[PDB]
Amino acid sequence: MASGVTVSDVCKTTYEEIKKDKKHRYVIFYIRDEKQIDVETVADRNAEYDQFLEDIQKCGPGECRYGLFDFEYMHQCQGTSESSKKQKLFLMSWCPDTAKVKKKMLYSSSFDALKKSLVGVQKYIQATDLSEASREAVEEKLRATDRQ
Template sequence: MANAASGMAVHDECKLKFLELKAKRIHRFIVFKIEEKQKQVIVEKLAENVPKSRIFFIAWSPDTSRIRSKMIYASSKDRFKRELDGIQVELQATDPTEMGLDVFKSRAN
């Protein structure tokens, strides 16, 4: 069972949906979520039928999060990211201003 030191397990659906995004280009974005009770990363939301050109990995961890949640997130992020081969741009954000359209445009080039 995964814990805060080793990170959360990654549900198979996460890898499947990421492969669909990468290979078939049928998703515009995927929101993954750490489900603490299930001790794994799951798919929370999809946006379909929109072609994409770059794959961004956005690590969202607001400053207002609980310390325990931040620890679980930090230990799970790298393990999860290794499961998703093909990420082209990574952003770490703690505030919405760090994910503005101007940030995406500058990082996409």
Template sequence: MASGVIITDDVKNLYEAMKVVKAGDDLNSRVKVAILLIKDSKEIVVGDTYTHQDLEAKPGFTILTEQMDKMECFYALYDCSFETKDGVHKEDLVLLMWTSDGAHIKKKMLYASSKGNLKMALKGIKHDLQINDRSDWSKQAVAAKMSEKHSWVVAKIEGMDV
């Protein structure tokens, strides 16, 4: 069931900027983590963003964990850097949906029913995670999700062993 929530152009433009690295791009200013929120039950908008430079002080995984402590529900675009067991470095965009068990049921339903439209608007998302409980959120769970459709196995996320 679609929710009728629209995806703003700012979200679509941010996604396009995150997925395509162009020659000459300033890597320090590239957005690596973006929080997306449903505003007024009507539209998905860009909330906080964190650049490559921001992630030097605190990894994206940690930032997302902190956001889960602060907010009941959100989506996130996470440009995840990881290394396979073969030592190959990769980066893939992950769409994450966080709906805490403690969130109001109407809010959880709104996020769940809007996710399909968001995925359709963000063509090319390779990985999506739905996290409802903090026990679902671990480097091991992210690595397993990212490995499931591929022949490679994730060994490290943002330089941290899985």
């Protein structure tokens, strides 16, 4: 990583689909050649967050990953179960920053780089280790930027 990342076309095609048809519920980005952004994992609502969690950590422990998720979250308030169905896009960087510095240098540039490609996402948050990246930890950061 020499500060300045190239986004692969796989990211564009996924975004153009997820923005219109959104049958690519969440796209997992991987870091390409340690200087480019790539898409090496895609999944839809057929898989749940548990399967998502297990599969990514199975694919690799300590490297850089990203995830753009467009889902309709129903937020209810005041004990009134109106359930405000709000579709929200979130970007999450799955990368152990606490690991090898050569690895965290890579996502350092690309974290802001892909924001240009998947522009329109609401919140971008990083999750380092499996302790920080869990299904519950995912719902916490998505509601933290919401409104009661």
